[PDB]
């Protein structure tokens, strides 16, 4: 089914998943049968699921269907890379929140949509949208014919959703900080116990982090242009802010785009490099998603030096 | 149903609808009871009429959906601000007009269409896309559940469609100059009567005139972007133009797009300032519309002479 | 039907179809009905089918629907002056050829799908993506209600099926240059000879190579616009490219965005004016054609000496 250089490079943490919309469902497909078997899920629903949660991405410019193919994807390597330290049920859970987590994104931030006074901003009071964002999974899965989680007993049903929720919800980068903080002082101090579930939580949400930032993992002419959409949402979210009346924080300021290489140094430096030197130390496998961070960091040096 | 700001802002005749296209028609809605009550509209048709008002707009960059219900809101902030002097239907009529006073524009004036020989050209000499539109809202109420005015009286229903066609042929700018000289005669007389119903007409028109400008009322930020979806369009008409063998004058050609300033200053000076000044003869609350213009007016003058 | 204008300009080799999307059809059947009689495709049909290619064309910012009936028509320019030349079947079969050309084009290449290892280029070795094009020809004639064909017999069917087929394949300009070498060898021996089946191929597939490059045979404006369209294709594949790793040739690559005149008089140079040139030798009343095009590498000459 999948071409040969696919079924190669896919292993590859920072493999890209093309320009063809069309051949994501079965790169997703193939990843799910290869991580649970192909006896798990049942075909005909799966398209059907991944069709429909498809239809629920927007066309906006970066948290879009193929961002979330790619953030699937890049589960699928860490994953893939540390065999029999998850479960059946996370793995099928963690790829399926990876697919969903930013379901019906507007390429607003959840500050925006407060200031905004958004209905959903009154629903959900923090994570607003990552709440949404597994508020719109379900609403998938209680379509008929959309079921994929039959085969399931109603135990484990619950359990992978609630794998699925927190795992979404983790995808909100306020969260990131405190998350990461306290798997640092678990490191340190060896008091990391994986057979402890609200420390799998984390190390999950982590993981979940880690996946919703792989852009900056990738070879640099995939990072570079990737950065063009995420700061085009941002400049149109500064619009809308400026719109309300509020003086946008710079980084979401078009005026101010001379600018980015030291916003993405300072990404870079807070929040990129401590998540995967975290992850490399809990899991060491993933170390090249650590390196490819590295290397695009020197890359937005060599940006702001003039070696562009 | 609507949030806390939008209900509080709503009222003010600079409010910005939003990025969030979902919100649009409750908006409408919400403006529609709150001018003709909770009980002249059934609400499973007005809702479906809405929607399909919505999909025969086009994705083009400024004569859009959300310009139908900015345009819309406009009329209601004026209505509301003068209440008594209006009749039921009439802002019924005018809310609904101006919902659809730009109905299927595909971003080309007049005289483009006239150019490229457009067979609605053929069909009307005159107000060639204005006639378009209100047929289109002919159309649109024909259809099978879409009959908004249903609970009419056959006079009431005439009478409604006619409010409804004058109002949307008065958005053809070419029909505004003329008319604003009248009322102006009128006013500086003392003759005009707005129990007469031809002066109704062009105060109804002017009216109209000033809800389909109203981008230039806005506050700063969102009256700057706006200006480049304006020419966004202006320039792809330019452009058309070209391909005919016709060099567009200079306001549509995009080689001369370092002239904006001094075409807004050009169009505020002949079209927007004395508009608003003359409906706030007529109609002096709406006063913050006119001292909004003159702003943007003094903001443009600082674009000129360098001081952006 | 068609507009006054339209009929008049609609014989002129440098015809632009214009901006309003919903008159192509009408344009596309009133040339079929003019070049084979109004008899022979039954309307009903025929816009079945032909709005059924359309939806099979992608939104891509060159080859798509627009181009397709751009193509189309400078065939009908070409048959139209050409007349006694071609059978029935011939004008009919390049007609529809040209129309579904590039169906399901997605803005890329035959070498990006070699490089990316797309499944198409397993199933096509060469021509790629013309012999998925023609795949998708047959396709929707096959569909309930599209078979325009069905008045022919099944000799006709298989016969005008052939003519299409060698026709799509025909655009994949890395035949050109060989058919058109073939060709100019035939003309200055006096060997070309049209009653020859083979040799009627080769001036078939040099009409089509006519027609799909005929941007260059518009007047400038037309020209360098389109231009445009055909480098934002060009540049994404470059960035396509270098996101495989492959550092892609310099047409392709937007940072030398600098020498695309330069590019232009290669173009022309090397394959437009060769193919026009050749066209005129074997069909005269082509000479426009060719005409525009020394006029257009005129004006990208000016271009490049800074008259612009
Ligand atoms: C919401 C986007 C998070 C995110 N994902 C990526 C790949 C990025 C990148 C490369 N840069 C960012 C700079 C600031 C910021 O602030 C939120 N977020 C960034 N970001
Ligand atoms: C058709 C657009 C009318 C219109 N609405 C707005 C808000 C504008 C603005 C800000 N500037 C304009 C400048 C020229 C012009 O000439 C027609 N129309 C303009 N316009
Ligand atoms: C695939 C496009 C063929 C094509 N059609 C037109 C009208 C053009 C033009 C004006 N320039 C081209 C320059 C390079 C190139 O290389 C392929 N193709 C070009 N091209
Ligand atoms: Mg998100
Ligand atoms: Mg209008
Ligand atoms: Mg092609
Ligand atoms: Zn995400
Ligand atoms: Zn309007
Ligand atoms: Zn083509």
Request: hydrophobic content about 35%; some cysteine.
């Amino acid at each position: 089914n999948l071409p040969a250089r696919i079924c190669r490079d896919i292993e590859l943490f920072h493999f890209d998943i093309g320009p063809f919309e069309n051949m994501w469902p079965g790169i997703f497909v193939y990843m799910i049968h290869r991580s649970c078997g192909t006896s798990c899920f049942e075909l005909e629903k799966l398209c059907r699921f991944i069709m429909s949660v498809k239809k629920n991405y927007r066309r906006v410019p970066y948290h879009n269907w193929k961002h979330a193919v790619t953030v699937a994807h890049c589960m699928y390597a860490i994953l893939q890379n540390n065999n029999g330290l998850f479960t059946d049920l996370e793995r099928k859970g963690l790829l399926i929140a990876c697919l969903c987590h930013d379901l019906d994104h507007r390429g607003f931030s959840n500050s925006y949509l407060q200031k905004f006074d958004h209905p959903l901003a009154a629903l959900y009071s923090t994570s607003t949208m990552e709440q949404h964002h597994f508020s719109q999974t379900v609403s998938i899965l209680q379509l008929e014919g959309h079921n994929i989680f039959s085969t399931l007993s109603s135990s484990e049903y619950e359990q992978v959703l609630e794998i699925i929720r927190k795992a979404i919800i983790a995808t909100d980068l306020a969260l990131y900080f405190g998350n990461r903080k306290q798997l640092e002082e678990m490191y340190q101090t060896g008091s990391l116990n994986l057979h402890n579930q609200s420390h799998r939580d984390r190390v999950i949400g982590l993981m979940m982090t880690a996946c919703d930032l792989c852009s900056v993992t990738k070879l640099w002419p995939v990072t570079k242009l990737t950065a063009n959409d995420i700061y085009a949402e941002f400049w149109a979210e500064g619009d809308e802010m400026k719109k309300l009346g509020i003086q946008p924080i710079p980084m979401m300021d078009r005026d101010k785009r001379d600018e980015v290489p030291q916003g993405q140094l300072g990404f870079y430096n807070a929040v990129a490099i401590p998540c995967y030197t975290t992850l490399t130390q809990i899991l060491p496998p993933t170390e090249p998603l650590l390196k490819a961070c590295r290397d695009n960091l020197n890359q937005w040096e060599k940006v702001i030096r003039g070696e562009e």
